[PDB]
Structure 1
Amino acid sequence: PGVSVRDVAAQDFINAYASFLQRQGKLEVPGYVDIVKTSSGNEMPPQDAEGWFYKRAASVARHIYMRKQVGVGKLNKLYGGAKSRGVRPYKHIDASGSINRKVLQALEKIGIVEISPKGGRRISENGQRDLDRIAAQTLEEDE
């Protein structure tokens, strides 16, 4: 009966954990958040202009806790959008690597994600503890 990330919903976990990271604020947030869209297969920057980066980091940390390890190209593949090419149809386009690198440096600087000797970003046991605790608090929101 362990309260963990494996029990909560996806979008609720991302909303809650992004809210905890917003109220903390103790991460590495760049200055091109208001400037740069998350992928070249987009027209407009994300609507949560002051807070889409925390949503991005919450999605990343949730995607890391559930599996062995991730990379930058894997998270570029995960975000991938159907891009219109005008008169040409939609095609799959991977996202920017800079957002992945800065999210993983922000979550590695706080001590949640860590580089694993298979060349991969894995969840730290402190990050395991923190995500399981906030998932427990997300479950306690539901009482």
Structure 2
Amino acid sequence: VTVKDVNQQEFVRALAAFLKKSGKLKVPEWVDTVKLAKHKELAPYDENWFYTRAASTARHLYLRGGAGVGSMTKIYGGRQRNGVRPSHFSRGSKSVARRVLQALEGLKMVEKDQDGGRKLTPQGQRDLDRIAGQVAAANKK
């Protein structure tokens, strides 16, 4: 089975739990004192947002390769409400997930592409497929 035939929400939650269990993803110094997005009015509600977002990011990188900082910021954009003024669109943040892609580099699941960006390594693809099979097995039973 591939990652397509499993629930996307449960696959992300399972991968985030797996990263928490391993505990080897690189954690920046600014743990729970920064906002995930520019548009937000508050800090992230729940902890382990670093693991959950890294889980989703690895999934987006699986579907589409050769993605860099500019590609990621387009993806995770958020609905920026500016109160009295009409609301507009804001791209995702930059530095925090640079620690995520350095974390993935530390865990040896991303590799620099020939022209730019980061591409999935065999180690990362194998891990994503087995956890997908475990998710499917858990859903069935």
Same structural fold, with TM-score higher than 0.5 when normalized by the shorter chain = yes
Matches within 5 A, 1:46-125: 46-49=44-47, 51-125=48-122
* TM-score normalised by the chain length of structure 2: 0.94
Question: 1:128 offset after TM fit, Å?
Answer: 0.6
| Secondary structure class of the residue paired with 2:108 | coil
Provide the rounded CA distance (Å) in 1 between the counterparts of 2:70 and 2:97. 9
Kindly provide the CA deviation profile for residues 77-96 of structure 1, in whole angstroms up to 9, marking residues without a partner as x.
Answer: 11111111121111110121
**Identity rate, percent:** 49
| Secondary structure class of the residue paired with 1:86 | coil
Gaps of 5+ in 2: none
Question: 1:4 offset after TM fit, Å?
Answer: 2.0
Question: 1:100 offset after TM fit, Å?
Answer: 1.9
Question: 1:5 offset after TM fit, Å?
Answer: 1.4
Residue in 2 that maps onto 1:20: 18
| Secondary structure class of the residue paired with 1:108 | helix
* TM-score normalised by the chain length of structure 1: 0.93
Greater than 6 Å deviation, 4+ residue runs: none
Aligned-residue Cα RMSD (Å) equals 1.1
| Secondary structure class of the residue paired with 2:87 | strand
Question: 1:139 offset after TM fit, Å?
Answer: 1.0
| Secondary structure class of the residue paired with 1:8 | coil
